[PDB]
Design an enzyme around this catalytic site. Sequence first.
Site, PDB file in Angstrom:
ATOM      1  N   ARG A 110       0.649 -67.769 -43.917  1.00 50.25           N
ATOM      2  CA  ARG A 110       1.162 -66.465 -43.508  1.00 50.25           C
ATOM      3  C   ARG A 110       2.384 -66.021 -44.304  1.00 50.25           C
ATOM      4  NH1 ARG A 110      -2.326 -66.542 -39.562  1.00 50.25           N
ATOM      5  NH2 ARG A 110      -2.043 -67.788 -37.666  1.00 50.25           N
TER       6      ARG A 110
HETATM    7  N1  LIG Z   1      -5.073 -57.319 -47.952  1.00 51.18           N
HETATM    8  C1  LIG Z   1      -4.957 -58.643 -47.833  1.00 51.18           C
HETATM    9  N2  LIG Z   1      -5.098 -59.406 -48.939  1.00 51.18           N
HETATM   10  C2  LIG Z   1      -4.984 -60.732 -48.826  1.00 51.18           C
HETATM   11  N3  LIG Z   1      -4.738 -61.461 -47.735  1.00 51.18           N
HETATM   12  C3  LIG Z   1      -4.605 -60.680 -46.655  1.00 51.18           C
HETATM   13  C4  LIG Z   1      -4.694 -59.301 -46.617  1.00 51.18           C
HETATM   14  N4  LIG Z   1      -4.500 -58.834 -45.323  1.00 51.18           N
HETATM   15  C5  LIG Z   1      -4.302 -59.923 -44.626  1.00 51.18           C
HETATM   16  N5  LIG Z   1      -4.346 -61.076 -45.367  1.00 51.18           N
HETATM   17  C6  LIG Z   1      -4.161 -62.446 -44.893  1.00 51.18           C
HETATM   18  O1  LIG Z   1      -4.658 -62.525 -43.572  1.00 51.18           O
HETATM   19  C7  LIG Z   1      -3.639 -63.024 -42.680  1.00 51.18           C
HETATM   20  C8  LIG Z   1      -3.811 -62.385 -41.328  1.00 51.18           C
HETATM   21  O2  LIG Z   1      -2.603 -62.537 -40.553  1.00 51.18           O
HETATM   22  P1  LIG Z   1      -2.585 -62.053 -39.042  1.00 51.18           P
HETATM   23  O3  LIG Z   1      -2.938 -60.615 -39.033  1.00 51.18           O
HETATM   24  O4  LIG Z   1      -1.273 -62.402 -38.333  1.00 51.18           O
HETATM   25  O5  LIG Z   1      -3.729 -62.898 -38.339  1.00 51.18           O
HETATM   26  P2  LIG Z   1      -4.311 -62.362 -37.000  1.00 51.18           P
HETATM   27  O6  LIG Z   1      -5.575 -61.612 -37.260  1.00 51.18           O
HETATM   28  O7  LIG Z   1      -3.271 -61.414 -36.344  1.00 51.18           O
HETATM   29  N6  LIG Z   1      -4.613 -63.646 -35.974  1.00 51.18           N
HETATM   30  P3  LIG Z   1      -3.320 -63.815 -34.906  1.00 51.18           P
HETATM   31  O8  LIG Z   1      -2.060 -63.419 -35.605  1.00 51.18           O
HETATM   32  O9  LIG Z   1      -3.212 -65.315 -34.442  1.00 51.18           O
HETATM   33  O10 LIG Z   1      -3.537 -62.886 -33.651  1.00 51.18           O
HETATM   34  C9  LIG Z   1      -2.323 -62.720 -43.383  1.00 51.18           C
HETATM   35  O11 LIG Z   1      -1.313 -63.639 -42.987  1.00 51.18           O
HETATM   36  C10 LIG Z   1      -2.693 -62.893 -44.860  1.00 51.18           C
HETATM   37  O12 LIG Z   1      -2.576 -64.241 -45.295  1.00 51.18           O
END
Ligand SMILES: Nc1ncnc2c1ncn2[C@@H]1O[C@H](COP(=O)(O)OP(=O)(O)NP(=O)(O)O)[C@@H](O)[C@H]1O
Lengths: 461, 469, 468, 235, 238
Positions: free
Chosen positions: A340
């Site tokens: 993250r």
């Molecule tokens: N455009 C992008 N390009 C590359 N990696 C991405 C992109 N968007 C998101 N990510 C990756 O996807 C991860 C998603 O994080 P996050 O949104 O906190 O997970 P989540 O869906 O919210 N699950 P949670 O946080 O436990 O509820 C990010 O930390 C990045 O590592």
Amino acid sequence: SDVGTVIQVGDGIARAHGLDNVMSGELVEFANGVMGMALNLEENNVGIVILGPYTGIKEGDEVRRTGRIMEVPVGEALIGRVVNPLGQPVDGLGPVETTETRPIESRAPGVMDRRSVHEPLQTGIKAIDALVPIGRGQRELIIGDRQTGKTSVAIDTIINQKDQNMISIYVAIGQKESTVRTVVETLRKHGALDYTIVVTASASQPAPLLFLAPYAGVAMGEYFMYKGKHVLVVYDDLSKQAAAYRELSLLLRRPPGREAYPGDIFYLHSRLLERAAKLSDAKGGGSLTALPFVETQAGDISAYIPTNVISITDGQIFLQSDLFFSGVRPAINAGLSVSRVGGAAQIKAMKKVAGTLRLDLAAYRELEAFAQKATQAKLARGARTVEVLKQDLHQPIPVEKQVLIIYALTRGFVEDVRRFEKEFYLFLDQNGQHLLEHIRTTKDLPNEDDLNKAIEAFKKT
Amino acid sequence: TRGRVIQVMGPVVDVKFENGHLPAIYNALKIQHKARNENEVDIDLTLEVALHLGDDTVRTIAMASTDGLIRGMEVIDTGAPISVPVGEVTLGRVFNVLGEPIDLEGDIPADARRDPIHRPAPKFEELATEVEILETGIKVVDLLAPYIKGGKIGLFGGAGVGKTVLIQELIHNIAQEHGGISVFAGVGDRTREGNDLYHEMKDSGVISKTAMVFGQMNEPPGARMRVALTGLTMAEYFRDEQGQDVLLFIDNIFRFTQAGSEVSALLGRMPSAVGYQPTLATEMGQLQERITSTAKGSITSIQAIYVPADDYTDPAPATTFSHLDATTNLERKLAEMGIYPAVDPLASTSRALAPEIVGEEHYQVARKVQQTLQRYKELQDIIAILGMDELSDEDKLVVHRARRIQFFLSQNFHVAEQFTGQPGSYVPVKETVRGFKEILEGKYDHLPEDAFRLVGRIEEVVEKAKAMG
Amino acid sequence: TRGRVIQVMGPVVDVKFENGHLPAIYNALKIQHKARNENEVDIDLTLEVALHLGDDTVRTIAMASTDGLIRGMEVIDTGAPISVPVGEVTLGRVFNVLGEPIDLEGDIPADARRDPIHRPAPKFEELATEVEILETGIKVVDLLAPYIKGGKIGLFGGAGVGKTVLIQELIHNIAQEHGGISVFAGVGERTREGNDLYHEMKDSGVISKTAMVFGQMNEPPGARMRVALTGLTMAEYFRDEQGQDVLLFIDNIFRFTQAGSEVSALLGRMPSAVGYQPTLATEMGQLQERITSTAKGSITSIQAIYVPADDYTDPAPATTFSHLDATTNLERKLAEMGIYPAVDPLASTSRALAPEIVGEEHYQVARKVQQTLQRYKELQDIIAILGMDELSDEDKLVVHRARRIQFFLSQNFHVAEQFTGQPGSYVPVKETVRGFKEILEGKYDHLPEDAFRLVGRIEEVVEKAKAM
Amino acid sequence: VGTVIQVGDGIARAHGLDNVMSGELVEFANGVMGMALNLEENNVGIVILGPYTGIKEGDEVRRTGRIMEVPVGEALIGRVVNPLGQPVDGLGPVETTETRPIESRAPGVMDRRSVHEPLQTGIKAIDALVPIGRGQRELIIGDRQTGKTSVAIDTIINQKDQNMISIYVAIGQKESTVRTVVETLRKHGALDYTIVVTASASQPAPLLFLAPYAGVAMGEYFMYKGKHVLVVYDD
Amino acid sequence: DVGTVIQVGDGIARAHGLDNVMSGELVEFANGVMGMALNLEENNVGIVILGPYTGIKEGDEVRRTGRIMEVPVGEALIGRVVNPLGQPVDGLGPVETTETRPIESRAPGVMDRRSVHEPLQTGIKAIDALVPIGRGQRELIIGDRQTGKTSVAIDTIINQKDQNMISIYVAIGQKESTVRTVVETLRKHGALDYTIVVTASASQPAPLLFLAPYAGVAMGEYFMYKGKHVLVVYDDLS
Ligand SMILES: Nc1ncnc2c1ncn2[C@@H]1O[C@H](COP(=O)(O)OP(=O)(O)NP(=O)(O)O)[C@@H](O)[C@H]1O
Ligand SMILES: Nc1ncnc2c1ncn2[C@@H]1O[C@H](COP(=O)(O)OP(=O)(O)NP(=O)(O)O)[C@@H](O)[C@H]1O
Ligand SMILES: Nc1ncnc2c1ncn2[C@@H]1O[C@H](COP(=O)(O)OP(=O)(O)NP(=O)(O)O)[C@@H](O)[C@H]1O
Ligand SMILES: Nc1ncnc2c1ncn2[C@@H]1O[C@H](COP(=O)(O)OP(=O)(O)NP(=O)(O)O)[C@@H](O)[C@H]1O
Ligand SMILES: Nc1ncnc2c1ncn2[C@@H]1O[C@H](COP(=O)(O)OP(=O)(O)NP(=O)(O)O)[C@@H](O)[C@H]1O
Ligand SMILES: [Mg+2]
Ligand SMILES: [Mg+2]
Ligand SMILES: [Mg+2]
Ligand SMILES: [Mg+2]
Ligand SMILES: [Mg+2]
């Protein structure tokens, strides 16, 4: 007075009649010499969890209040020793002679007490440092099947980082008592022991002492923090600690939940993993990072414990068993693993070269299922990047060397690739001082022309 | 200063005592009675204490049949753990779980020293760790998972794959000529095998260096647990006070944990995920943490665990992986292919598979074999649905070899002579490491599909193929 | 009145009110204690009532992580539920569950106006009926599942799929222009993100028009339940009296449900189904019907939903699905494919897809793209066994164009600059409908598929091919 | 009269109430109604149809002395009503005089008749391939979406020329959705021959439990007086 | 040695009193049905009914048999079909057997066994030719329904006349039509004059179905301990 009698004993769980002023989390002593921890206060009885062997206690035994919350003795006197979850030494060598103790049920630091992750951390493995980076202060999770290349990550991390002003705590949980020796000795073979602490709680000891096993190590790293430091904590496994908590809860007459696992598991992990912090400038500017390990049956990432655990950590490294035998070591899945904090804590040389290489390897993995001229070049580049990232045991590569070969990898420069790595390292170690010192000093890539002549001169040789 | 019985629930008896005379855990209780009227029955019984439940009562687990226990009878407390003979006097004899002789050859008087069963595991200042190879001559085992002296070797298999066959083969190949004291605990196996090995040992002259105790299937749930402990309390003495290397063989130690599940539901505990006692990990740890080497000697134990079905995700066998130093797994699906032993090459591993302990020529061939077998395992669905002819030339060439490797993993055991026209054959480690090289480089790969079945060295393969035309 | 604590099991505390007057349900109460000797710990804490029993006993839920609770402590009644500060004083601040500030900019005095958290829902005769299209610049969301202004919006996702990046893109794009009072409430995310967001707000300049509430994971269920309703308690006063528009982002309301499970086993309720408490619908409806748009003011609300096990046939998502006006689903398969965002077009639906709201130029193109992406789903699975040229060329054209259609759905965001290292690009809805019409027109059959990954306006694609 | 002992989640247990019958209505001082569903030896289980936050232990409970009754009438057509006999749209009282019990017995086998006269909705598929008669019960099963509400709306709208007094019920749904459906119907004048019963999510689950019983009790009166009735359930 | 029954739930009963009752003992109700004791709590005894429980009421007198689970054995049961409790099925007068065996007896163990070298002549070609059997061996017959398992046991038991082996056939949870077809086949071929048939049909309570094999083996081993050879078959363990 603050006295009581025991009228039920079994499997390390006792029920006490009396002890009016006992507080929750308070220690309470037996005449046998082993302490106990209160976790329940009914109307007329108190629920005590025994903190050691239970062959001596009998019904009618007197039990005495002590008057203090959970403690761990901490200080620089423990560096190099091997200690229990409590302050009793394991290797003998006399008592540790600590003065101060920490109440480790204390509140975790909150908002405005924290800052962004900023300083890079390195394990010396191209697979981890490059594709799925880690920053100092991050919580990065290692989950996987049994016997798939886990403990090597932590041991090589502690071995490589001897060059720094850091402090490391390593914990082995629920393992057979002798299992730790091969670890404890191997550190001493490379000298990594002279600045660390090892905590063990064996299966010979009662299950409740596993339930405090990961709590104490984070408190040791906590006491080393609140002064400007860089601290690591590793728990070799948490799943057996979850099982220990489950089987501790069951005899207390508390109803079950979704599994045999009680529903408080998330709360427990929230109490643990959140204890880490990267404190701000007005607090001391330290760093406490953790590397938890989790095991699941048949590698089912969708199970209760894996999904529960993932929701808290700042990322995950997924070790997949079916790549393990194919010859990709460590078997990190470049598609499923996530981090993250990303590029917040990383040297600026890697941004210019391989800031987005991970998406390339994920795309290559996705296209492999379809492939089973642009596609041909994509496949060739993907095969080569998979080939480069491999590393062996107890042979780390410093952070100053990785960027130079990653540049050649990510700028378009298969049977002999791995030896090409080592011979390139030799060529640099004998000639490329003028580049290496610059990488050491400014943490930015030197002139591209000079690197190009160096690379082309090697390729001509 | 005597006890009483008020409640009986089968394997569980709820004895009661008076103030100040409460027994401790693992203490032994004795009940004797003679018929006062013709309606009563004579039975002598012994019991083991497990829990304290207040109101001057303790729970105990019966060691023999509990039929005919009239309520209100008297109980005797020994005040000491169950005591079983140990030392020189126990060589060649056979006992039950309570320690008495069952070979009917004679008695053993009190002058022989006997120790408590339960004692805490050694401290970290007493343990030791070293790695060195124990050899068996089996082709499939010695390469992909060599054994370690003083370590733990685990056998995993379903309801019949050949576990006992492997145990007896190891005994025939190692236990007699190893030079160390041998103990065989017949935990939970068939009584027929138990009385067959007694003849097998006495008529062969090896019985002079062996000790045995039996706990076979017919016995009540209380007895089936402590057979392993009564077997281990003798190997411990042979290791420590006599400085002898000890081999210990156990066949159905899993019957330990299952026995707990039988008694726990009667003791009064809440159930686990699938009904187990909520003490599986801690009790198995308290069991296997005493099978250790020390600075004075080494104990090597080969054990097998009964998997309740074709599902390794079951908690009771899954939690065994926390203690094993070498693992061997069996499955029905390979046994049915006509290949014996049906050891799976991609799930049996060992700590001794390291390049500084076995050499480059060993680690290289092991890794090459595992890598070559992984691809053939992965191609399973597509070769099954549509056929081996679909894949490309470079995949067809790979298909040509994996089954031959799997066939070469087969070997005729010495106890299979009664079922096969040839006796057991021996292949040393230096030969089993050599053998796979020829097939991997294509020296002998062109032979037909069935010639590699039931063969010894690589030279026998070519003569068997010639015998086939 | 006075009470004495008699039982404690952690999250649940059982007190006795012998005074003859019994506090009502949802009344807060306080405990204060100073040590009699140096072994005890001085404490001061509130607790919340949730039951009655026939011995003047009351059961209370814990909203703070506590050790050191003792028997015989005295409890005093407050007589009102949790009160949240509202009005001018609330703007540019961060608060906790009980209403105290979190930041170090100073105290808030007692003359402020505070509203109780819990009220009955609005009625049938006053809810708004008209809706309008809201533009966010997100290519997929603005086209296939438009967010009707004044309605409820849901982001459905699993573990680590990409919800937070999209939600922060939304609060970056919308709140910077929209003049409505913005409230962001976190129920179940990580503390690090919550602490980073406050500093980012202090730099963004939105802090003047925004308030925040926190407490996050490191506290028992009692706080994680009420932290969702605190921000709604602020938005309620802003809508009902002041009358300006309001933005309400609420983050991981799932943990409002999940928290209710953990206390349930101790409160005397039996388990149900997977293990959730029996009062799922009753507890959740009292929340989901409070956030509504009325004739007096318009409330626009976005929510985050985390699927418990990446599988949607779970009672919590089933109960949540009944209140959203537009849902966008995220599939972890799309997360692993490397085509972000991970919105699956098939299961994403909205009330806006009507001819009288989006027009005829929208409906035909959206339906054709949706139908083509549904058709490709089974042909791509047939390809996995039947081969790649055994299928007819006309069938293969479906894949040949659906691959481009799916790849062009990716967008290079502005808040992902840390993970991407790129500043991004901007698109209006007209360009989105226009670009999909061209991609179906056949103008881009010869451009490589990989050129369409993480681009914005269609005009960029011809440049990237120029780059290649 | 008796006393209340335990309260929680809208459920109460009371001591007293010696002659309370099963299904008898009970009332509290606060004015909210309740239904007795379980009769134990020393306690009676009361299930509450409204907001319960104000009830305290020690409150008095009074027996009403009657079974569930639902007022009915032709003038109710057009009005939107709760599953209980209360106005939700305002506009004064409900304009009813007669009340029916909810526990009406099902017709016997000899009181029935074969069916050969159809019902129509206006869709080529359902009206032909899976035909429905004017005495038939037909099941609709599905997940969320796929357009289940459209079937009900077509069944109600199309019944313009062919007389059919209709009752649409929406159980546990958000009030905005039911208002939108009502307005869409209003564009076609369906309120002249339709009655709507709504019990929102904020309403206690007992109202959801009682809704379809009212959706048949309000519709059987036109039958037993000699009129043709249709009843449709949202969920 | 008196008491009262206070629970009659679902074929299981609880009894007051019974101070001297032992585990595994037989018990008789005043209605005339046999039962047994499996659990003895602090102030009550659990009893399992071995017959028709519809006639038991609260307050019924219950009595002590005074001995463990003994089933009669001997030569007088030869030529009869008997209930597991020791009652003839097809009439023909009461049994004359005097000797009895407890069906819970401790099995023979070490120093009481020997290898196997002699066959059990089955006469079914495909079995003896491929999967041989010997005396003392325990061979599982397992498989699917409606395939002919019982037709193997019947042929094996008819072929035993030349080897002089007293035998027992046990029927569990089975339909009386097949039971009487088998009995008619045996009486036609004459096997009933040395075989003993015990049955416990599907219309019988569960405890009889649970106890039937124990009696079937207890009435069979008695001839072993006197030197004779015995073959025993069970109809279904499932
Ligand atoms: N455009 C992008 N390009 C590359 N990696 C991405 C992109 N968007 C998101 N990510 C990756 O996807 C991860 C998603 O994080 P996050 O949104 O906190 O997970 P989540 O869906 O919210 N699950 P949670 O946080 O436990 O509820 C990010 O930390 C990045 O590592
Ligand atoms: N980089 C590597 N290259 C080759 N082999 C490796 C590497 N890392 C680990 N291994 C192998 O991993 C083996 C040990 O297995 P490992 O998976 O590390 O134990 P583990 O699962 O961590 N046991 P535990 O302590 O309970 O976590 C070693 O014997 C090595 O052969
Ligand atoms: N080399 C071999 N060739 C052919 N068949 C073999 C060979 N080795 C073993 N078997 C078969 O494997 C079966 C299993 O042996 P056995 O050890 O009796 O069962 P098991 O696996 O030990 N089950 P159990 O002992 O009850 O836990 C034997 O009955 C043989 O038929
Ligand atoms: N014949 C049709 N053609 C196109 N769209 C339709 C048709 N029938 C219904 N719809 C769609 O149905 C949507 C209304 O929601 P709908 O799918 O009926 O909700 P539902 O889940 O099926 N029933 P409900 O539980 O009340 O929400 C509108 O957006 C319409 O576009
Ligand atoms: N070996 C055989 N050859 C020819 N016919 C046979 C043979 N065995 C059985 N049958 C016939 O097939 C019928 C089925 O045999 P039967 O023994 O009743 O099956 P079964 O074992 O009782 N099936 P089930 O009741 O489910 O256990 C018999 O009644 C015969 O008519
Ligand atoms: Mg390890
Ligand atoms: Mg065997
Ligand atoms: Mg997130
Ligand atoms: Mg609808
Ligand atoms: Mg049959």
